[PDB]
């Protein structure tokens, strides 16, 4: 009771001190007795408000440290550790944003690792803050960290194992080196792919420390090649990728590099040999007949132009290199054809034959992280079903079916060429997010959970995504509901919205390219866009989703449950894609489960409002709430199910954001989430922008992406966030004033302009959030491939 008494009294002092610091004018607003009672209670006597705030914090730290000291004699000791730990962490952040905080970075590390020793969840999720605080305070904590993380159970790090192997080339590797090798001893398959993906980027420095790091990494690489089975599995999966697509990606990552003169041929030759090792040299590690046919058609021309060696392309010719690649690609996008038997493209997967005591190919993504692993029940690969189905997209990924040893069949979506680490960490954020949603009463009683699917990056330019079965994408659902008159009249008719919109954009601008928006945002006033939007809105049938669910269901209770599940799941992913700020939510990026009705969100390219920052035509909406989603709930208005789901989920997040803001922080502070990766990501996508006509690197600075996210989780107007975010990306745009004028609203037609900028509440914020996403002035002048009329 003494320990809990001191926890509570320290929390009281912390609440008062955080209250006076948020607005230090309410202290001179309340009462002459109340102000004097606060000024007495801190003990400091200055009447300056800054010293009385620091004195309140000192009393809070005194009481909480007394609680930690009293806690050293399961549910009540780790609470005492975590209150002091997150208090000193919050103080440290309040210093590091802009001599009292001296003994804090030792204290956070010590008490947080002690809590993680005692099977905590809130200390397990707040662990990468320690590896972030090690670098920024290396004097107080580099050997303390090591001697305390030594005696911590090795499987507590599996969820954050992709940070340690990236830390393993630093000045502070010794603080993690014990747990990495303990993981390699106990559970080797939990570290294999994050080790492989981080061996690509080490750059070991030249000290007595860096050489020991190189010795340690070589030791772990010797320990992880159990027969070299995984590199065969990765290579045979890498066979399942279109070769003209790998060539076009190589043209991308050679052209941009070669445009930087004095081009410095050292990395260019490495890029070329990595091209020729897979698309060149035919006597290869085990290619199949697909890649073999490709090489026999186009391997002789790769030294006719680029030279044996590769020093023949070193006459950079930055226009004529594109001429070479176009001369290739004109044939290349015709001659290839994706094969549909697994023996025709990957003989190692065709001839699997799990061997007589060699190893085990565990099916990837099975160490989630929490609890003891117990890999006796993990699924191992017995063989691959010989039916590969190609999806119909530009970056067409193949679908394989892995027959696991436990009587069952698992389908996966193998896609090569792109970096899946962003998708994996967004899914990890969703795990944190609907772990928060489960520990809330009003959300668990509604049973609100985001549908998560596992994403595994094997290496760069190759990864496996779990296949979600009996699902179909939303645009395919809407287009399969349509009758052959509605369907073909929507697809081939010049008065249909996908053809009328382009005419209306020429009618406003004059041109036929993406520069039409930088003239239509200024040239078209508010009533023209709204009226033209309704005229191209009423051409699609009014109730496609209701007819989809009617012909999808067989009884009125079935229809009611399908529509209620669609509504709840879509409102949850609408409010949870805005907190992260995920953009480019067109109709193919949603997938609806045909046997249950729920919505799944896929394809997380744009992470933190980079849709409304970096695209040429920005996307000024929080989420997808077009006319179908609100005709489905008719006769009930928009105060119905979706509004209460959004309000309940937003309140559940904004109750305690300490867990969420830290995880968004360690996601956005990753070096692999940077401008080089985003630039090379949107290049192989077509999408809204085709090239970069920017001034220097477009100024990606993640200092304030999370400042925006903390503002919107603390209470902000959402349209204030949109102007604040396109101010970072569109100030040198010719239509910046009209972008802000469109996003801000009217003070006449919209609730988002009739509110303050900040200090909002949950009902109010979702009110002006649903107002923005349904604004016809916003939907009428947004991107043409987004299809806002649906």
């Amino acid at each position: 009771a003494f320990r809990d008494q001191n926890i509570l009294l320290g929390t009281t002092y912390r609440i008062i001190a955080n209250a006076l610091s948020s607005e230090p004018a309410c202290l001179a607003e309340i009462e002459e007795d109340k102000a004097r009672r606060i000024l007495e209670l801190s003990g400091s006597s200055s009447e300056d408000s800054e010293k009385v705030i620091a004195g309140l914090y000192q009393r809070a730290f005194q009481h909480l440290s007394e609680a930690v000291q009293a806690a050293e004699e399961a549910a009540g000791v780790i609470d005492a550790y975590m209150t002091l730990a997150d208090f000193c962490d919050q103080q440290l952040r309040k210093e590091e944003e802009n001599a009292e905080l001296q003994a804090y970075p030792a204290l956070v590390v010590e008490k947080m690792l002690k809590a993680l020793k005692l099977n905590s969840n809130e200390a397990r999720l707040k662990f990468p803050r320690l590896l972030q605080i090690i670098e920024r305070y290396p004097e107080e904590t580099l050997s303390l960290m090591t001697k305390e993380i030594s005696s911590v159970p090795c499987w507590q790090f599996i969820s954050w194992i992709s940070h340690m192997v990236a830390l393993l080339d630093k000045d502070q590797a010794v603080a993690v080196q014990h747990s990495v090798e303990e993981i390699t001893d106990n559970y080797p398959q939990a570290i294999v792919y994050p080790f492989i993906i981080s061996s690509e980027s080490y750059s070991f420095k030249d000290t007595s420390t860096g050489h020991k790091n190189k010795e340690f990494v070589a030791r772990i690489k010797s320990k992880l090649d159990q027969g070299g089975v995984i590199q065969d599995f990765i290579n045979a999966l890498d066979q399942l990728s279109n070769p003209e697509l790998l060539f076009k990606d190589w043209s991308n990552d050679v052209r941009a590099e070669l445009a930087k003169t004095p081009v410095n041929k050292k990395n260019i030759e490495k890029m070329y040999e990595r091209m020729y090792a897979a698309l060149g040299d035919p006597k290869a590690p085990g290619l199949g007949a697909f890649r073999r046919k490709f090489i026999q058609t186009f391997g002789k021309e790769f030294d006719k132009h680029f030279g044996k060696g590769g020093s023949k392309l070193l006459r950079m010719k930055l226009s004529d290199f594109n001429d070479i690649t176009n001369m290739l690609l004109l044939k290349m996008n015709k001659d290839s054809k994706p094969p549909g038997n697994l023996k025709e493209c990957s003989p190692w997967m065709s001839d699997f034959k799990v061997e007589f005591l060699r190893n085990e190919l565990e099916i990837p993504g099975q160490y989630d992280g929490r609890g003891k692993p117990l890999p006796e029940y993990h699924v191992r690969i017995a063989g691959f079903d010989e039916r590969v189905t190609v999806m119909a997209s530009l970056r067409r990924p193949k679908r394989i079916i892995i027959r696991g040893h436990d009587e069952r069949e698992h389908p996966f979506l193998v896609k090569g060429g792109e970096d899946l680490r962003q998708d994996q960490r967004v899914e990890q954020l969703f795990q944190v997010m609907n772990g928060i949603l489960a520990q809330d009463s009003a959300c668990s009683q509604r049973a609100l959970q985001l549908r998560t699917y596992s994403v595994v990056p094997m290496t760069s330019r190759l990864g496996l995504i779990e296949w979600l079965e009996n699902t179909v994408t939303l645009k395919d659902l809407l287009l399969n509901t349509m009758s052959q008159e509605e369907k073909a009249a929507y697809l081939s008719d010049p008065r249909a919205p996908p053809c009328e919109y382009k005419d209306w954009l020429t009618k406003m601008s004059g041109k036929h390219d993406v520069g039409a928006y930088m003239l239509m945002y200024k040239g078209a006033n508010r009533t023209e866009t709204v009226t033209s939007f309704r005229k191209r809105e009423s051409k699609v049938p009014a109730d496609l989703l209701k007819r989809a669910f009617v012909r999808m269901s067989t009884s009125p209770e079935a229809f009611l449950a399908l529509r209620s599940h669609f509504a709840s799941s879509h409102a949850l992913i609408c409010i949870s894609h805005w907190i992260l700020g995920i953009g480019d939510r067109h109709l193919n990026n949603f997938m609806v489960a045909m046997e249950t009705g729920g919505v799944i969100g896929i394809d997380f390219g744009h992470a933190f409002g980079s849709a409304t920052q970096f695209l040429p035509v920005p996307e000024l909406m929080p989420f997808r709430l077009t006319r179908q989603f609100i005709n489905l709930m008719l006769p009930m208005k928009e105060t119905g199910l979706m509004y209460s789901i959004m309000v309940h989920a937003l309140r559940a997040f904004r109750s305690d954001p300490g867990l969420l803001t830290n995880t968004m922080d360690v996601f956005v502070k990753e070096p692999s989430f940077d401008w080089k990766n985003f630039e090379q990501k949107m290049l192989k996508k077509g999408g809204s922008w085709i090239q970069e006509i920017n001034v220097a690197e477009k100024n990606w600075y993640p200092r304030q992406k999370i400042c925006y996210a903390k503002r919107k989780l603390a209470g902000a107007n959402p349209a204030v966030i949109t102007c604040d975010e396109l101010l970072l990306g569109h100030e040198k745009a010719p239509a910046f004033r009209d972008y802000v004028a469109v996003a801000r609203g009217s003070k006449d037609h919209n609730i988002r302009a009739q509110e303050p900028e900040s200090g909002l509440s949950e009902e109010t914020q979702v009110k002006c959030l649903m107002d923005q996403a349904t604004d016809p002035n916003i939907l009428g002048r947004t991107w043409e491939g987004w299809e806002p009329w649906m």
Binding site: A289, F290, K337, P339, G340, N341, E344, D385, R387, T389, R399, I401
Partner: protein, 40 residues
Amino acid sequence: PMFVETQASQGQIRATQQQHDFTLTQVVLYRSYRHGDLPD
């Protein structure tokens, strides 16, 4: 997943003949349909 076939390389029905090749354990002729072949 159905088997998509192999990538390419680089008076109605026949009647029941009574004469076999393989012995049992321990130009062909055609006919038409006789009312129990197909469903009615």
